[model samples]
Target: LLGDFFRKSKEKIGKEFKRIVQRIKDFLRNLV
Candidate 1:
């Protein structure tokens, strides 16, 4: 069903966003 398709895409996006945010945090931390 299209519902599952939408859910999977959103889940992927959520994880990717989290990963990007984490990377940015680490990058800033290394500047000290």
Candidate 2:
């Protein structure tokens, strides 16, 4: 059960990180 919870959290964090990176890339593009 504990392992399963960690795996789920990891998946959620990975998805959030990708979204944040995409936003940052867009912001940088606008600046350039």
Candidate 3:
């Protein structure tokens, strides 16, 4: 179903976002 497709894509994108957030923190720490 289309609903399931969006749900899966969102979950995958969310995982990538989590990585992005961790990367941002690392960048900020480097700035200190």
For candidate 3, give the lDDT of residue 20. Answer: 75
Q: Mind giving the per-residue lDDT tens digits that candidate 3 earns over 1-32?
A: 98999889888978887987898788879986
Task: Write the number of the candidate with greater TM-score, choosing between 1 and 3.
Answer: 1
TM-score of 3: 0.49
**Where is model 3 poorest over a 10-residue stretch in terms of lDDT?**
23-32
Which regions of candidate 2 are displaced past 4 Å?
1-3
Candidate 2 whole-model C-alpha lDDT, 0 to 1: 0.86
**TM-score leader:** 1
Against the hidden reference, what TM-scores do the models get? 0.59, 0.52, 0.49
Please give, for residues 1-32, the per-residue lDDT of candidate 2 as tens digits: 99999889888878988988888789878975
Lowest summed lDDT across 10 adjacent residues in model 2 is found at 23-32
Clashes of 2: 0
User: Which residue runs of candidate 1 sit more than 4 Å off their true CA positions?
Assistant: none
Give lDDT per model, in order. 0.88, 0.86, 0.85
**Residues 1-32, model 1: lDDT tens digits:** 98999889888878888888888899899999
lDDT of 3: 0.85
